[PDB]
Ligand SMILES: Nc1ccn([C@@H]2O[C@H](COP(=O)(O)OP(=O)(O)OP(=O)(O)O)[C@@H](O)[C@H]2O)c(=O)n1
Ligand SMILES: C[S@@+](CC[C@H](N)C(=O)[O-])C[C@H]1O[C@@H](n2cnc3c(N)ncnc32)[C@H](O)[C@@H]1O
Ligand code: SF4
């Protein structure tokens with residue numbers, strides 16, 4: 617079966633923000649108790665996991681859990697790469713002082729350098745850019761690789777962000793085409809409806825061309841993003857995106873990694889093509 621080399625653990629669906637396009641919505645509030653999460657991460661390490669990305673939901677709503685799992689993954693499991701993806705609003709310098717030795721990469725999601733755009737998207741109330749520059753400084757102080765995540769959508773796809781990227785200098789800048797997932801952001805009935813925010817393949821290509829001088833840019837059109845991730849939900853079930861859905865396997869805590877992965881689609885050619893294997897720690 618497939619080797620789960622790089623895994624996203626969406627350990628909670630709770631979030632403090634209202635992004636209109638969110639594709640991983642607040643449909644539950646279950647979080648595994650730490651002994652269960654540690655068991656799951658151990659099974660993944662044994663299956664060949666080298667990199668773990670803590671996601672959600674907003675991970676910094678759970679600093680006690682997140683700190684425990686980061687320290688366990690780096691100190692006990694000896695993973696090559698421990699990363700977090702965050703909206704940045706609840707990141708405190710004290711967390712980076714306490715756990716920063718165990719954090720390889722911190723990714724901050726910021727879709728625009730124009731505050732009126734961040735407000736229209738639902739990601740903040742006007743302080744996202746100032747917070748992003750402060751987190752960038754903290755990553756330099758505590759020796760953490762600084763990563764920026766941008767969702768390219770109808771509200772920001774015409775924006776020129778070169779001047780801010782030249783000041784921030786993230787080692788890695790993910791540019792995601794906004795993606796529709798059935799049961800998350802596709803319906804009148806879901807917690808979000810992203811259909812008004814979608815862009816064409818040509819609009820996404822023009823965004824990337826506008827930023828051709830940024831060597832850190834990692835573009836992810838829908839064809840590369842949809843099925844190229846190994847996604848563990850808040851019950852440590854793999855989510856299968858074959859349908860354009862997020863259909864859960866059995867928990868790795870019930871059937872093990874191999875049985876859970878067996879009937880999950882993971883497009884390894886797409887994963888390699890988007891740059892899923894990279895220099896993901898400081899010694900790289
Ligand atoms: N159909 C999909 C595809 C991706 N994602 C999520 O989108 C996020 C993308 O964040 P990113 O920073 O790309 O994740 P990493 O795995 O850390 O990226 P990399 O290792 O390439 O730096 C991940 O949490 C991933 O699980 C999702 O929820 N549904
Ligand atoms: C769901 S968030 C979870 C982590 C954290 N709450 C955050 O926003 O960074 C994970 C990543 O997916 C991005 N994202 C969310 N919805 C998306 C969508 N519909 N299409 C593409 N990327 C999306 C986010 O902006 C973020 O970089
Ligand atoms: S993308 Fe926005 S709404 Fe979705 S989990 Fe991250 S901050 Fe929350």
Ligand SMILES: [Mg+2]
Nearest residue numbers: 716717719759
């Ligand atoms: Mg570090």
Ligand SMILES: [Mg+2]
Nearest residue numbers: 825826827828
């Ligand atoms: Mg150009």
